[PDB]
Scaffold this active site. Structure first.
Site, PDB file in Angstrom:
ATOM      1  N   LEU A  19      50.062  12.488 -12.455  1.00  0.00           N
ATOM      2  CA  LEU A  19      51.224  13.353 -11.570  1.00  0.00           C
ATOM      3  C   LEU A  19      51.736  14.471 -12.282  1.00  0.00           C
ATOM      4  O   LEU A  19      51.826  15.473 -11.789  1.00  0.00           O
ATOM      5  CB  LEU A  19      51.727  12.419 -10.704  1.00  0.00           C
ATOM      6  CG  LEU A  19      52.854  13.041  -9.815  1.00  0.00           C
ATOM      7  CD1 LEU A  19      52.123  13.888  -8.700  1.00  0.00           C
ATOM      8  CD2 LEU A  19      53.813  11.973  -9.287  1.00  0.00           C
ATOM      9  N   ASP A  20      52.502  14.141 -13.351  1.00  0.00           N
ATOM     10  CA  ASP A  20      53.574  14.935 -13.665  1.00  0.00           C
ATOM     11  C   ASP A  20      53.763  14.303 -15.420  1.00  0.00           C
ATOM     12  O   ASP A  20      54.484  13.312 -15.513  1.00  0.00           O
ATOM     13  CB  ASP A  20      54.813  15.115 -13.219  1.00  0.00           C
ATOM     14  CG  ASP A  20      55.711  16.091 -13.833  1.00  0.00           C
ATOM     15  OD1 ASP A  20      55.637  16.155 -15.059  1.00  0.00           O
ATOM     16  OD2 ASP A  20      55.927  17.123 -13.080  1.00  0.00           O
ATOM     17  N   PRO A  21      53.120  14.950 -16.209  1.00  0.00           N
ATOM     18  CA  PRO A  21      52.231  16.263 -16.307  1.00  0.00           C
ATOM     19  C   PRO A  21      50.666  15.918 -15.877  1.00  0.00           C
ATOM     20  O   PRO A  21      50.375  14.916 -16.161  1.00  0.00           O
ATOM     21  CB  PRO A  21      52.213  16.664 -17.700  1.00  0.00           C
ATOM     22  CG  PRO A  21      52.325  15.600 -18.673  1.00  0.00           C
ATOM     23  CD  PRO A  21      53.117  14.489 -17.952  1.00  0.00           C
TER      24      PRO A  21
END
Length: 439
Positions: free
Chosen positions: A123-125
């Site tokens: 999702l992030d990163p």
């Protein structure tokens, strides 16, 4: 067609469910946790192995040679050990977490080994990387340029489970998110770099995010958005900002935990209880409950009844036993997990919001926006698991099918990677829309 997973969960579950569909793939797992690795095998047919990756680094090196691809779902600090093992036997690797400065030192050797390792998937990163390059590349096809980039992202409960003092429920331990508040933030706005100091004063930077009139959101800067100029190749940009989203009231509540001196790694002091613990921080001796009330509210500063009641609601003034912990912050993190966790039938959700200022050769300006919203499935995976697990699980299948031809470390920055992944996540229930106007 043989894969080794390092890490027992919970991100592994969707990783296995996805890879274990055609049935022509052999899965192997290794973990420290004995009960977790055991329960996992009950759901998915895999070969269990018990190993502390650090101490038995020997047995790891041999098993790596027996696999086609390794997936590292372990804490991001243990990654250099899996890299040194994969390069030795020339096996590919995929990782969901950041590519730390430590791991960056091998790019030469990882290239000489003639194999591929992919980092920063999830999702992030991860998706934030992919949505960024998908738009930048699209703007390059028509010779356009990026003047601004704003990206807000946050994982939070579905609105119907938001009625608690933090308007939040933790998928994993809060230690990480709680410590983030004490850190700084750096971003570029209209050409001038902006620095935000963490700690008690960070609350001053929280803003209202109104792009969904039906949703009560707040936002605040993430950690250092300036570095992303070189990663995306948009140094020309004059505005570069990454942020985080929560429900209104979340940060002001965490601000109370700071006032009371709860966010720190100092060691803890008949079992010790929360009432007794806070009497120490307040400075008073262990006394009646209505007394610490007047003392806590006094340290909470002003008539902050909101922050007071929030601490009462969580039982921080009660006689509940403080859980065994290595510090005070570690202790609070364990109490919030106990009080604010997801029920079996409670939904979570994910929200991303991007904004681009694109300058075309003609001279006009395109304002482009992207919305990505996903809800967790009751009897299925959560929205966080699906967004963290599938991008790295899909990348693995792509290598095993020879779809990725590149060679090196790379990220999901290339169309060869982000292209296929972005299209295949739609079928899994992760949908994003787009809109554009010109001025």
């Amino acid at each position: 067609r043989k894969v080794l997973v390092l890490g027992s969960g919970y991100i592994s579950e969707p990783v296995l469910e996805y890879l274990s569909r055609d049935g022509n793939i052999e899965i192997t797992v290794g973990s420290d946790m004995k009960n977790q690795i055991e329960q996992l095998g009950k759901k998915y047919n895999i070969n269990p192995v018990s190993m502390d990756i650090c101490k038995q680094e020997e047995k790891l090196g041999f098993l790596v040679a027996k696999q086609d691809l390794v997936i590292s779902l372990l804490p991001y600090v243990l990654h250099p050990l899996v890299a040194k093992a994969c390069i030795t036997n020339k096996v590919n690797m995929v990782t969901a977490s950041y590519i730390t400065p430590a791991l960056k030192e091998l790019e030469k050797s990882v290239e000489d080994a003639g194999i591929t390792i992919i980092g920063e998937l999830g999702l992030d990163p991860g998706l934030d990387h992919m949505l960024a390059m998908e738009s930048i590349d699209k703007a390059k096809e028509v010779g356009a340029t990026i003047e601004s980039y704003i990206s807000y992202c946050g994982g939070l409960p579905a609105p119907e489970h938001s009625n608690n003092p933090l308007r939040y429920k933790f998928s994993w331990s809060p230690v990480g998110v709680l410590m983030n508040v004490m850190q700084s933030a750096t971003y570029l706005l209209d050409g001038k770099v902006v620095n935000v100091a963490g700690g008690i004063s960070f609350l001053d930077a929280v803003t209202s995010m109104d792009f969904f009139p039906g949703l009560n959101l707040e936002g605040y800067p993430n950690r250092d958005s300036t570095k992303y100029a070189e990663i995306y190749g948009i140094s020309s940009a004059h505005t570069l900002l990454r942020g985080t989203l929560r429900y209104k009231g979340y940060m002001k509540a965490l601000n109370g935990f700071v006032k009371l001196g709860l966010i720190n790694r100092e060691a803890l002091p008949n079992p010790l209880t929360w009432k007794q613990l806070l009497c120490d921080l307040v400075g008073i001796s262990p006394s009646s409950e209505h007394d610490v009330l007047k003392e806590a509210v006094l340290k909470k500063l002003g008539g902050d009844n909101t922050q007071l009641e929030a601490a009462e609601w969580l039982g921080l003034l009660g006689d509940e036993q403080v859980p065994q912990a290595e510090s005070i912050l570690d202790a609070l993190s364990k109490h919030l997990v106990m009080k604010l966790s997801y029920g079996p039938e409670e939904k979570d959700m994910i929200v991303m919001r991007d904004s681009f200022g694109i300058r075309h050769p003609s001279g006009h300006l395109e304002h482009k926006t992207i919305d990505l919203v996903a809800y967790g499935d009751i009897n299925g995976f959560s929205a966080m698991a699906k967004t963290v697990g599938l991008p790295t699980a899909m990348a693995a299948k792509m290598l095993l099918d020879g779809e990725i031809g590149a060679k090196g470390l790379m990220g999901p920055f290339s169309k060869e990677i982000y292209g296929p992944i972005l299209e295949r996540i739609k079928a899994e229930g992760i949908i994003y829309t787009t809109q554009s106007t010109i001025k």
